[PDB]
Amino acid sequence: LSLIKVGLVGIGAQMQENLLPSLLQMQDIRIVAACDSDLERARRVHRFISDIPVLDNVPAMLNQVPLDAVVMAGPPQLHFEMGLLAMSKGVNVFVEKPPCATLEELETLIDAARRSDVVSGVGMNFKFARPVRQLREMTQVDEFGETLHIQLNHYANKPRAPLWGLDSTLRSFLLAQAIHTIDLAITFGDGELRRVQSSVQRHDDALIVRADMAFSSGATASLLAGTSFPYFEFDMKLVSSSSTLVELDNLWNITLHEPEHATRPTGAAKRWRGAWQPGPLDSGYERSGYHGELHQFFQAIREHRRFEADFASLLPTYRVIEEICSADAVAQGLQNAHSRIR
Amino acid sequence: LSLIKVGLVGIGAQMQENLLPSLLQMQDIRIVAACDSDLERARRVHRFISDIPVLDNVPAMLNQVPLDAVVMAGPPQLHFEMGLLAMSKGVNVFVEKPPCATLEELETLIDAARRSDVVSGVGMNFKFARPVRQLREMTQVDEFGETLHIQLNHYANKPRAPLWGLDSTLRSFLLAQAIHTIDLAITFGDGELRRVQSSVQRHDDALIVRADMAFSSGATASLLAGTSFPYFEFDMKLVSSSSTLVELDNLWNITLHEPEHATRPTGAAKRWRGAWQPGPLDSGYERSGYHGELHQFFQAIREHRRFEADFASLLPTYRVIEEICSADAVAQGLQNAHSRIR
Amino acid sequence: SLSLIKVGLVGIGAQMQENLLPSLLQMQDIRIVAACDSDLERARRVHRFISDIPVLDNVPAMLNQVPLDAVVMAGPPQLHFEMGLLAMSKGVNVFVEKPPCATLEELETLIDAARRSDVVSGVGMNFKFARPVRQLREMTQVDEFGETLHIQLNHYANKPRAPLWGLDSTLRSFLLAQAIHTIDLAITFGDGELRRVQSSVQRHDDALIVRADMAFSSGATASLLAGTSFPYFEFDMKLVSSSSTLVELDNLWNITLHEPEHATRPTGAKRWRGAWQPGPLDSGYERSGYHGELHQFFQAIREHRRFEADFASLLPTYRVIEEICSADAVAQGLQNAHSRIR
Amino acid sequence: SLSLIKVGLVGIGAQMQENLLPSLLQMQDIRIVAACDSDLERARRVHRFISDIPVLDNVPAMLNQVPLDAVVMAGPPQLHFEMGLLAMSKGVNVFVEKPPCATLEELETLIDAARRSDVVSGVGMNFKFARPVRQLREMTQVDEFGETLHIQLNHYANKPRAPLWGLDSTLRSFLLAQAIHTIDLAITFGDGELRRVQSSVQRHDDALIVRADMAFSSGATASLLAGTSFPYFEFDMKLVSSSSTLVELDNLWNITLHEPEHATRPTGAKRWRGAWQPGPLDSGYERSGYHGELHQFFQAIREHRRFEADFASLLPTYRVIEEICSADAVAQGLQNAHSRIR
Ligand SMILES: NC(=O)c1ccc[n+]([C@@H]2O[C@H](COP(=O)([O-])OP(=O)(O)OC[C@H]3O[C@@H](n4cnc5c(N)ncnc54)[C@H](O)[C@@H]3O)[C@@H](O)[C@H]2O)c1
Ligand SMILES: NC(=O)c1ccc[n+]([C@@H]2O[C@H](COP(=O)([O-])OP(=O)(O)OC[C@H]3O[C@@H](n4cnc5c(N)ncnc54)[C@H](O)[C@@H]3O)[C@@H](O)[C@H]2O)c1
Ligand SMILES: NC(=O)c1ccc[n+]([C@@H]2O[C@H](COP(=O)([O-])OP(=O)(O)OC[C@H]3O[C@@H](n4cnc5c(N)ncnc54)[C@H](O)[C@@H]3O)[C@@H](O)[C@H]2O)c1
Ligand SMILES: NC(=O)c1ccc[n+]([C@@H]2O[C@H](COP(=O)([O-])OP(=O)(O)OC[C@H]3O[C@@H](n4cnc5c(N)ncnc54)[C@H](O)[C@@H]3O)[C@@H](O)[C@H]2O)c1
């Protein structure tokens, strides 16, 4: 296969922990430049690949190094600005979430993606996580019937203050975290988003966000998310029209509840379920989705088709984010005037 | 202690499986009559206690046998009609849920309870279940802070048709099942019910009900319930203002997530939680709540105080049931006219 | 219908009050007609449930004054042994909590007395009658399970850490108070005569850890880990069969069953397994075995058949127990002899 | 900064491609400079990641033509043994997958060669370096844990069910392919010299079940259950300490830690325990041990120190392995001799 030539931007924590390692073990791709404002961070790639250029700004990299793609892991502002620059030069663009800070910015990125006709992508790794893929495959099987209801629980401890210079801690949380689980909702909903209701509770610097979504397919989704928890954890469920209930705990173990489940020593006795977890030595970046999201991005480049987590795919997710922030602004407003008056 | 004299009504399945066994091992109470339309069912109590009267109708029992209390496990219609009769005779009344079929009937029972000044009770065993009690005790402890959010998941497979001659399968499900988990919501909400939103999805003869509740205390509750599942199961969670998350799975095991949990061999290392489950030989009727609900009912009689699950305590639960049925009737109506027209 | 079996209770302490008595109280067609205890106030506790029945402070007096068909005892083995012989000579059926006696030779006297008297004798070997143990035993008798090759038993406790009932040995006390249960489970699943036993004990302060391996003529092997070197009582076990089936039972609660080629309808595959646990409202005394051990004991009386946990049934377990104590004393004798040699 | 360590790969089959190679590719400051395989097309698979580097179909040729500091092998023990001696005589550091050889006597030749050549030698004993095993080992070195009294190891597999690498024995093949890992864990936690070993093997068709017990001079005992009589590879282990602490590690994933007087802030008590598992996005090769085994091997090269899984470190495990095969052949010799006597 022809080698895909990749330039890296923002060699910080998520680049070093997850993306770079995935790229390093990724077939038929070559990393040919690294860029970071702090050039010493860029040179971290020399620990793996000697000699390749390190640059302190993206424009220099785009001008000196021939590239089929850039993979970026920085702030929304980086992804937005340089994202547009890279696309304007005909380079395919993969960025960590969030791709940008606003719906209107996303619409700008979408429009540029279409005009430049390049493959775009966002690092929505939950979508590509092996156990999530397995669940998605279940929804395609006849005996599962239809997905009626999706429940998502997404715990985190931060952010407890605004990020990237945004005024709002809620908007920061939605873009830093909930973006993942809202997108999972849109993914399993499978059909057009038809209604969104939501609410936000605050306590000190902590948040609990509840969002409910209905889809044209008839399916509903409910998300509990926030920063009022000790650490990042994630659990989801699916309820199907054939009375199948599927639970995925921590992207690790699956529990499958269905009428008339059996084992051979017992036959179909009341209350048997199926359970599944990985083997003890499960490793790499598939279970977590980093491998999958990059692999498919590159594939979409090879066959010049759409990448499933391109900018446009995020359109419904940004609408939900916007709606969650608008409703909260109204709620806050009313409560503030209430008090001001009483 | 003086012996409390108890008459039983409706010696069917739930009486034989749970209540009668709890009464039989209950200190200082005496069963002194059994009543059932099918006298052979009433005589099932002769398997345990010889000679005591068996009657085929409640009025006969109230006229011939001196009683401090009746415990009933039949249809709502039995509980309502004979409930009022027993109270009119100055007898304390314990009935299985549902105590009746409508808000207006509950209001009638409440008013009679107050006029007769007797102890009333409903067999809301989830409230009294040992693990639920443990959770409630946690909410009373300073380091827990306040309960911000309560999540309840209540799976069942039935009813898939209307019960007790009601027109509505939804109302049957709400009274047969969800009554338990809605009441748990009101219990942990602790404060006045301030808003209720809800939705009902149908598929064939199966239902998925989603209800959200907000309390004056600031706390919110979300319930997922229905008959679109293989068997009865129940999971709940609490999110507290101190970033404590508490999970109770199947009234069996508890998981307690909190900042800086430790073990002695490790110190407070990232991602340690507390877990708790009963010992292997856990038995009787405490874990499940049947013991507790009856014990406290009898106690309320001894000290002539209120029983915590008396008729009045169910007032907010019936309001939610009514609201869920009203909203569904509107939704159905609109969808029916939509089609009729298109 | 059925005739009432008349039962006297001896030893109204903790195990009588927590499990046995409650079980008896809900048992069809038996009457508790007398309670006997050294401490007449303990005997009187029955009056919380059943008025007027005679209380005695010694077994001889109860046997003279009250017509009885069976006694049920929960005291020390000295009481089980002596009063159990006395009740049997008067043609009374005898049920005793473990342990029935302190020594193998005692057990042999018991066995002999019970054969000559032609009464039903029984020991409260409740693990053996526990509903999930029954489910495990049932799989074992099914062709596709194949043969049971290996049985792993893990029995944890925190006591006794001092000798019991005036015995000299903390090891003998532990084996008689705790391990007896799991040694007997091993015999029960081994199914075949005991061919070989190896054991060892490790001591640390007042705590111990016993390991014992058993081989059976059926080819099956068993391995047991038990001691007091733990925080609390817990129990897990495993079965390995010749169809490559592994069955795990954790705390008499959940069952995991691993077998080649397990499936779900939505996935058709590797690493799928079966899981089972009771419903949330599981209650009474079946799961723990107290109900079944008693119910079978009474059935055996009515049908004049052998009760499966009679004194004889315990012979192999007391053999194992002797062999562990002998071996240990030799290991101890050596270590001490090695030391006064240094 | 650091000098680049130059690595040749030998044996580009499944374990090289799934774990070792990906680990090497993300390893700071090492360069893969050659790949060697009988099947040049397998060798060429490296070119999916690193262009142009020489491919050879034999180790001798690679050692002549390419300057190397270390080789990393993943082939049969015959290859590890012979080519491992060859690489060591040329002053090349040698890392090989298990097993490093087929026999104890081979291992001794390896140990001797490695001492004379003064190079770092190593075996891919990855369980030992697995992050959760490290956590367990760390608790063990902490005063309050007390001493480790007992170690229980359960190692399940479905293969091999036929002899491997032209060996005659399916038992030797299994011990060398699988149990080697868990025998070595036992040695590692036993901490003290091996005092005693007992074992037994049971056969059923083409499957086996090995039990082995080990005692150590530190007082610690170990008990291991391993075989092929199971659906799939799984692994769980337990530590019992003298502070009455029990630690369980299930499938290198979750840790349960039982200790007297555990607590939560909201409950202050009996039956509380600690639990731990990784976050949902846990990835790479640390958890499984491939990362750490390699990283330490390279660190040992740089510091010219001993690598903890060198050939010598494996001596006790190969001793155990011989003793299990000897014992088994005697047990077999007897059963057959008993039979031609019948
Ligand atoms: N999908 C996942 O699971 C998840 C996990 C972690 C973070 N993320 C995302 O990854 C991204 C990066 O976060 P991080 O935690 O590694 O933070 P970081 O501060 O450690 O890394 C960001 C890097 O970008 C660089 N950068 C900033 N602007 C630049 C510019 N104009 N040109 C070149 N370099 C520039 C920084 O100097 C830095 O080294 C985010 O958008 C974040 O939300 C994804
Ligand atoms: N709380 C729990 O967990 C839960 C579990 C099971 C059922 N319940 C409740 O228990 C109650 C009884 O249900 P059941 O399942 O045992 O059904 P059932 O049909 O088996 O028992 C009802 C009994 O009441 C009798 N009855 C009816 N009307 C009577 C009358 N006018 N006078 C005397 N007897 C009369 C019947 O003949 C019968 O034997 C309900 O209201 C039900 O919803 C509670
Ligand atoms: N493992 C289990 O299945 C379960 C658990 C605990 C106890 N056991 C068994 O039950 C028995 C009692 O245990 P416990 O924990 O309830 O202790 P306990 O405090 O209940 O003592 C039992 C009773 O027997 C009485 N007694 C002693 N000698 C008597 C005599 N000569 N005549 C009449 N009464 C006499 C005592 O006064 C006392 O009230 C034991 O043998 C024990 O191992 C069963
Ligand atoms: N348990 C674990 O930690 C993990 C798991 C599986 C395998 N292992 C070990 O890794 C090794 C290989 O296992 P595999 O499953 O990857 O099988 P495999 O299909 O990968 O075979 C390994 C490779 O070595 C090559 N080879 C054989 N002899 C050679 C020679 N003389 N010169 C050059 N190349 C030669 C083969 O052609 C082949 O491509 C074993 O010794 C095994 O036990 C590690």
PDB file of all heavy atoms in Angstrom, chain A residues 10 12-14 36-37 41 73-75 78-79 96-98 123 125 180 290, chain D residues 281, ligand 1:
ATOM      1  N   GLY A  10       0.677  19.361  18.392  1.00  0.00           N
ATOM      2  CA  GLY A  10       0.402  19.338  19.820  1.00  0.00           C
ATOM      3  C   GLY A  10       0.862  18.019  20.396  1.00  0.00           C
ATOM      4  O   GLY A  10       0.109  17.059  20.477  1.00  0.00           O
ATOM      5  N   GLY A  12       1.420  17.057  23.404  1.00  0.00           N
ATOM      6  CA  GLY A  12       1.150  17.051  24.826  1.00  0.00           C
ATOM      7  C   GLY A  12       0.758  15.680  25.339  1.00  0.00           C
ATOM      8  O   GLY A  12       1.119  14.641  24.762  1.00  0.00           O
ATOM      9  N   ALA A  13      -0.024  15.681  26.415  1.00  0.00           N
ATOM     10  CA  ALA A  13      -0.400  14.466  27.141  1.00  0.00           C
ATOM     11  C   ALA A  13      -1.188  13.427  26.356  1.00  0.00           C
ATOM     12  O   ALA A  13      -0.836  12.250  26.376  1.00  0.00           O
ATOM     13  CB  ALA A  13      -1.160  14.823  28.460  1.00  0.00           C
ATOM     14  N   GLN A  14      -2.293  13.822  25.737  1.00  0.00           N
ATOM     15  CA  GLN A  14      -3.133  12.861  25.016  1.00  0.00           C
ATOM     16  C   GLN A  14      -2.420  12.347  23.739  1.00  0.00           C
ATOM     17  O   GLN A  14      -2.591  11.183  23.355  1.00  0.00           O
ATOM     18  CB  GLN A  14      -4.458  13.509  24.662  1.00  0.00           C
ATOM     19  CG  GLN A  14      -5.342  12.780  23.590  1.00  0.00           C
ATOM     20  CD  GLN A  14      -5.895  11.383  23.964  1.00  0.00           C
ATOM     21  OE1 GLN A  14      -6.633  10.789  23.165  1.00  0.00           O
ATOM     22  NE2 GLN A  14      -5.521  10.841  25.105  1.00  0.00           N
ATOM     23  N   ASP A  36       4.857  21.612  17.523  1.00  0.00           N
ATOM     24  CA  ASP A  36       4.373  22.111  18.829  1.00  0.00           C
ATOM     25  C   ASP A  36       5.062  23.445  19.067  1.00  0.00           C
ATOM     26  O   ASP A  36       6.245  23.612  18.664  1.00  0.00           O
ATOM     27  CB  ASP A  36       4.741  21.161  19.967  1.00  0.00           C
ATOM     28  CG  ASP A  36       3.903  21.387  21.233  1.00  0.00           C
ATOM     29  OD1 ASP A  36       4.132  22.398  21.937  1.00  0.00           O
ATOM     30  OD2 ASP A  36       3.035  20.530  21.524  1.00  0.00           O
ATOM     31  N   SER A  37       4.325  24.399  19.640  1.00  0.00           N
ATOM     32  CA  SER A  37       4.897  25.702  20.044  1.00  0.00           C
ATOM     33  C   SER A  37       6.156  25.545  20.899  1.00  0.00           C
ATOM     34  O   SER A  37       7.112  26.286  20.771  1.00  0.00           O
ATOM     35  CB  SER A  37       3.864  26.520  20.827  1.00  0.00           C
ATOM     36  OG  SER A  37       2.664  26.531  20.057  1.00  0.00           O
ATOM     37  N   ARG A  41       8.857  19.836  23.028  1.00  0.00           N
ATOM     38  CA  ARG A  41       7.760  18.846  23.034  1.00  0.00           C
ATOM     39  C   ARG A  41       7.759  18.187  21.659  1.00  0.00           C
ATOM     40  O   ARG A  41       7.694  16.977  21.573  1.00  0.00           O
ATOM     41  CB  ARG A  41       6.378  19.439  23.390  1.00  0.00           C
ATOM     42  CG  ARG A  41       6.239  19.907  24.848  1.00  0.00           C
ATOM     43  CD  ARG A  41       4.807  20.006  25.246  1.00  0.00           C
ATOM     44  NE  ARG A  41       4.687  20.083  26.695  1.00  0.00           N
ATOM     45  CZ  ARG A  41       3.547  20.176  27.366  1.00  0.00           C
ATOM     46  NH1 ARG A  41       2.396  20.219  26.724  1.00  0.00           N
ATOM     47  NH2 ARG A  41       3.578  20.228  28.701  1.00  0.00           N
ATOM     48  N   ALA A  73      -3.644  17.195  18.563  1.00  0.00           N
ATOM     49  CA  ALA A  73      -4.166  17.067  19.917  1.00  0.00           C
ATOM     50  C   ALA A  73      -3.833  18.293  20.739  1.00  0.00           C
ATOM     51  O   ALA A  73      -2.929  18.266  21.590  1.00  0.00           O
ATOM     52  CB  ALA A  73      -3.617  15.822  20.586  1.00  0.00           C
ATOM     53  N   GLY A  74      -4.563  19.370  20.490  1.00  0.00           N
ATOM     54  CA  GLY A  74      -4.377  20.591  21.262  1.00  0.00           C
ATOM     55  C   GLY A  74      -5.709  21.181  21.704  1.00  0.00           C
ATOM     56  O   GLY A  74      -6.697  20.472  21.794  1.00  0.00           O
ATOM     57  N   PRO A  75      -5.743  22.493  21.977  1.00  0.00           N
ATOM     58  CA  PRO A  75      -6.980  23.211  22.292  1.00  0.00           C
ATOM     59  C   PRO A  75      -7.907  23.378  21.075  1.00  0.00           C
ATOM     60  O   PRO A  75      -7.445  23.368  19.929  1.00  0.00           O
ATOM     61  CB  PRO A  75      -6.493  24.599  22.758  1.00  0.00           C
ATOM     62  CG  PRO A  75      -5.043  24.594  22.700  1.00  0.00           C
ATOM     63  CD  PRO A  75      -4.549  23.359  22.044  1.00  0.00           C
ATOM     64  N   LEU A  78      -6.662  25.650  18.372  1.00  0.00           N
ATOM     65  CA  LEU A  78      -5.721  25.068  17.462  1.00  0.00           C
ATOM     66  C   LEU A  78      -6.465  24.283  16.361  1.00  0.00           C
ATOM     67  O   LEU A  78      -6.225  24.475  15.187  1.00  0.00           O
ATOM     68  CB  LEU A  78      -4.782  24.145  18.224  1.00  0.00           C
ATOM     69  CG  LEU A  78      -3.974  23.241  17.285  1.00  0.00           C
ATOM     70  CD1 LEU A  78      -2.931  24.077  16.501  1.00  0.00           C
ATOM     71  CD2 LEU A  78      -3.315  22.061  18.021  1.00  0.00           C
ATOM     72  N   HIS A  79      -7.376  23.402  16.754  1.00  0.00           N
ATOM     73  CA  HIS A  79      -8.040  22.497  15.805  1.00  0.00           C
ATOM     74  C   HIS A  79      -8.796  23.286  14.781  1.00  0.00           C
ATOM     75  O   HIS A  79      -8.804  22.927  13.618  1.00  0.00           O
ATOM     76  CB  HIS A  79      -9.011  21.553  16.541  1.00  0.00           C
ATOM     77  CG  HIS A  79      -8.337  20.698  17.576  1.00  0.00           C
ATOM     78  ND1 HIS A  79      -9.000  20.185  18.671  1.00  0.00           N
ATOM     79  CD2 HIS A  79      -7.056  20.279  17.690  1.00  0.00           C
ATOM     80  CE1 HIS A  79      -8.162  19.479  19.405  1.00  0.00           C
ATOM     81  NE2 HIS A  79      -6.972  19.517  18.831  1.00  0.00           N
ATOM     82  N   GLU A  96      -8.351  15.885  17.835  1.00  0.00           N
ATOM     83  CA  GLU A  96      -8.962  15.478  19.086  1.00  0.00           C
ATOM     84  C   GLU A  96     -10.249  16.251  19.336  1.00  0.00           C
ATOM     85  O   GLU A  96     -10.441  17.340  18.797  1.00  0.00           O
ATOM     86  CB  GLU A  96      -8.003  15.669  20.241  1.00  0.00           C
ATOM     87  CG  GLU A  96      -7.271  14.396  20.579  1.00  0.00           C
ATOM     88  CD  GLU A  96      -8.222  13.230  21.003  1.00  0.00           C
ATOM     89  OE1 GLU A  96      -9.394  13.463  21.376  1.00  0.00           O
ATOM     90  OE2 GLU A  96      -7.783  12.073  20.960  1.00  0.00           O
ATOM     91  N   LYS A  97     -11.165  15.688  20.099  1.00  0.00           N
ATOM     92  CA  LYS A  97     -12.319  16.500  20.489  1.00  0.00           C
ATOM     93  C   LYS A  97     -11.846  17.482  21.540  1.00  0.00           C
ATOM     94  O   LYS A  97     -10.893  17.174  22.260  1.00  0.00           O
ATOM     95  CB  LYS A  97     -13.460  15.625  21.039  1.00  0.00           C
ATOM     96  CG  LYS A  97     -12.989  14.298  21.637  1.00  0.00           C
ATOM     97  CD  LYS A  97     -12.678  14.253  23.138  1.00  0.00           C
ATOM     98  CE  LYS A  97     -12.614  15.572  23.921  1.00  0.00           C
ATOM     99  NZ  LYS A  97     -11.860  15.359  25.232  1.00  0.00           N
ATOM    100  N   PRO A  98     -12.485  18.665  21.639  1.00  0.00           N
ATOM    101  CA  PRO A  98     -13.533  19.177  20.778  1.00  0.00           C
ATOM    102  C   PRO A  98     -12.836  19.796  19.578  1.00  0.00           C
ATOM    103  O   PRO A  98     -11.750  20.342  19.710  1.00  0.00           O
ATOM    104  CB  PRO A  98     -14.192  20.284  21.623  1.00  0.00           C
ATOM    105  CG  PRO A  98     -13.209  20.625  22.689  1.00  0.00           C
ATOM    106  CD  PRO A  98     -12.086  19.661  22.653  1.00  0.00           C
ATOM    107  N   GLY A 123     -11.614  12.876  17.131  1.00  0.00           N
ATOM    108  CA  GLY A 123     -11.181  11.709  17.866  1.00  0.00           C
ATOM    109  C   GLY A 123     -12.243  11.270  18.865  1.00  0.00           C
ATOM    110  O   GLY A 123     -11.989  11.301  20.067  1.00  0.00           O
ATOM    111  N   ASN A 125     -13.318   8.534  20.209  1.00  0.00           N
ATOM    112  CA  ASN A 125     -12.830   7.184  20.419  1.00  0.00           C
ATOM    113  C   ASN A 125     -13.879   6.244  21.047  1.00  0.00           C
ATOM    114  O   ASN A 125     -13.832   5.053  20.783  1.00  0.00           O
ATOM    115  CB  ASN A 125     -11.517   7.226  21.240  1.00  0.00           C
ATOM    116  CG  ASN A 125     -11.733   7.712  22.682  1.00  0.00           C
ATOM    117  OD1 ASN A 125     -11.678   6.896  23.611  1.00  0.00           O
ATOM    118  ND2 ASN A 125     -11.992   9.025  22.875  1.00  0.00           N
ATOM    119  N   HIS A 180     -18.574  13.091  24.115  1.00  0.00           N
ATOM    120  CA  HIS A 180     -18.433  11.671  23.831  1.00  0.00           C
ATOM    121  C   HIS A 180     -19.722  10.919  23.958  1.00  0.00           C
ATOM    122  O   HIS A 180     -20.053  10.111  23.080  1.00  0.00           O
ATOM    123  CB  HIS A 180     -17.436  11.026  24.784  1.00  0.00           C
ATOM    124  CG  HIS A 180     -16.024  11.318  24.443  1.00  0.00           C
ATOM    125  ND1 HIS A 180     -15.187  12.080  25.259  1.00  0.00           N
ATOM    126  CD2 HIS A 180     -15.277  10.994  23.363  1.00  0.00           C
ATOM    127  CE1 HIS A 180     -14.002  12.180  24.705  1.00  0.00           C
ATOM    128  NE2 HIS A 180     -14.024  11.527  23.544  1.00  0.00           N
ATOM    129  N   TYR A 290      -8.946   4.321  20.304  1.00  0.00           N
ATOM    130  CA  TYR A 290      -7.939   5.126  19.603  1.00  0.00           C
ATOM    131  C   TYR A 290      -7.440   4.484  18.280  1.00  0.00           C
ATOM    132  O   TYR A 290      -7.386   5.149  17.236  1.00  0.00           O
ATOM    133  CB  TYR A 290      -6.765   5.459  20.527  1.00  0.00           C
ATOM    134  CG  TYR A 290      -7.236   6.166  21.779  1.00  0.00           C
ATOM    135  CD1 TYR A 290      -7.087   5.580  23.039  1.00  0.00           C
ATOM    136  CD2 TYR A 290      -7.853   7.407  21.703  1.00  0.00           C
ATOM    137  CE1 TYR A 290      -7.484   6.222  24.193  1.00  0.00           C
ATOM    138  CE2 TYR A 290      -8.297   8.044  22.870  1.00  0.00           C
ATOM    139  CZ  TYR A 290      -8.099   7.427  24.090  1.00  0.00           C
ATOM    140  OH  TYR A 290      -8.544   8.050  25.210  1.00  0.00           O
TER     141      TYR A 290
ATOM    142  N   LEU D 281     -10.607   3.751  29.838  1.00  0.00           N
ATOM    143  CA  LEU D 281      -9.742   4.023  28.691  1.00  0.00           C
ATOM    144  C   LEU D 281      -8.335   3.474  28.862  1.00  0.00           C
ATOM    145  O   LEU D 281      -7.414   3.829  28.113  1.00  0.00           O
ATOM    146  CB  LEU D 281      -9.744   5.512  28.352  1.00  0.00           C
ATOM    147  CG  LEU D 281     -11.136   5.914  27.851  1.00  0.00           C
ATOM    148  CD1 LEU D 281     -11.199   7.359  27.447  1.00  0.00           C
ATOM    149  CD2 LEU D 281     -11.596   5.015  26.712  1.00  0.00           C
TER     150      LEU D 281
HETATM  151  N1  LIG E   1     -10.424  11.374  23.398  1.00  0.00           N
HETATM  152  C1  LIG E   1      -9.843  11.185  24.672  1.00  0.00           C
HETATM  153  O1  LIG E   1     -10.118  10.235  25.297  1.00  0.00           O
HETATM  154  C2  LIG E   1      -9.365  12.464  25.331  1.00  0.00           C
HETATM  155  C3  LIG E   1      -8.392  12.403  26.437  1.00  0.00           C
HETATM  156  C4  LIG E   1      -7.531  13.485  26.726  1.00  0.00           C
HETATM  157  C5  LIG E   1      -7.642  14.780  26.079  1.00  0.00           C
HETATM  158  N2  LIG E   1      -8.330  14.784  24.772  1.00  0.00           N
HETATM  159  C6  LIG E   1      -8.162  15.946  23.938  1.00  0.00           C
HETATM  160  O2  LIG E   1      -6.895  15.990  23.462  1.00  0.00           O
HETATM  161  C7  LIG E   1      -6.515  17.318  23.168  1.00  0.00           C
HETATM  162  C8  LIG E   1      -5.209  17.809  23.785  1.00  0.00           C
HETATM  163  O3  LIG E   1      -5.162  17.807  25.176  1.00  0.00           O
HETATM  164  P1  LIG E   1      -3.899  17.484  26.112  1.00  0.00           P
HETATM  165  O4  LIG E   1      -4.532  16.901  27.418  1.00  0.00           O
HETATM  166  O5  LIG E   1      -2.879  16.436  25.539  1.00  0.00           O
HETATM  167  O6  LIG E   1      -3.297  18.909  26.626  1.00  0.00           O
HETATM  168  P2  LIG E   1      -1.758  19.416  26.521  1.00  0.00           P
HETATM  169  O7  LIG E   1      -1.667  20.927  27.044  1.00  0.00           O
HETATM  170  O8  LIG E   1      -0.941  18.605  27.330  1.00  0.00           O
HETATM  171  O9  LIG E   1      -1.356  19.224  24.973  1.00  0.00           O
HETATM  172  C9  LIG E   1      -1.633  20.147  23.987  1.00  0.00           C
HETATM  173  C10 LIG E   1      -0.477  20.454  23.089  1.00  0.00           C
HETATM  174  O10 LIG E   1      -0.796  21.363  22.041  1.00  0.00           O
HETATM  175  C11 LIG E   1       0.152  22.325  21.946  1.00  0.00           C
HETATM  176  N3  LIG E   1      -0.374  23.470  21.279  1.00  0.00           N
HETATM  177  C12 LIG E   1      -1.208  24.355  21.693  1.00  0.00           C
HETATM  178  N4  LIG E   1      -1.430  25.238  20.645  1.00  0.00           N
HETATM  179  C13 LIG E   1      -0.542  24.929  19.643  1.00  0.00           C
HETATM  180  C14 LIG E   1      -0.227  25.509  18.440  1.00  0.00           C
HETATM  181  N5  LIG E   1      -0.936  26.656  17.968  1.00  0.00           N
HETATM  182  N6  LIG E   1       0.623  24.946  17.653  1.00  0.00           N
HETATM  183  C15 LIG E   1       1.251  23.847  18.015  1.00  0.00           C
HETATM  184  N7  LIG E   1       1.028  23.324  19.212  1.00  0.00           N
HETATM  185  C16 LIG E   1       0.124  23.868  20.006  1.00  0.00           C
HETATM  186  C17 LIG E   1       0.734  22.562  23.278  1.00  0.00           C
HETATM  187  O11 LIG E   1       1.843  23.351  23.424  1.00  0.00           O
HETATM  188  C18 LIG E   1       0.780  21.123  23.794  1.00  0.00           C
HETATM  189  O12 LIG E   1       1.977  20.476  23.906  1.00  0.00           O
HETATM  190  C19 LIG E   1      -7.802  18.127  23.476  1.00  0.00           C
HETATM  191  O13 LIG E   1      -8.522  18.856  22.570  1.00  0.00           O
HETATM  192  C20 LIG E   1      -8.478  17.263  24.562  1.00  0.00           C
HETATM  193  O14 LIG E   1      -9.701  17.669  25.025  1.00  0.00           O
HETATM  194  C21 LIG E   1      -9.035  13.648  24.318  1.00  0.00           C
END
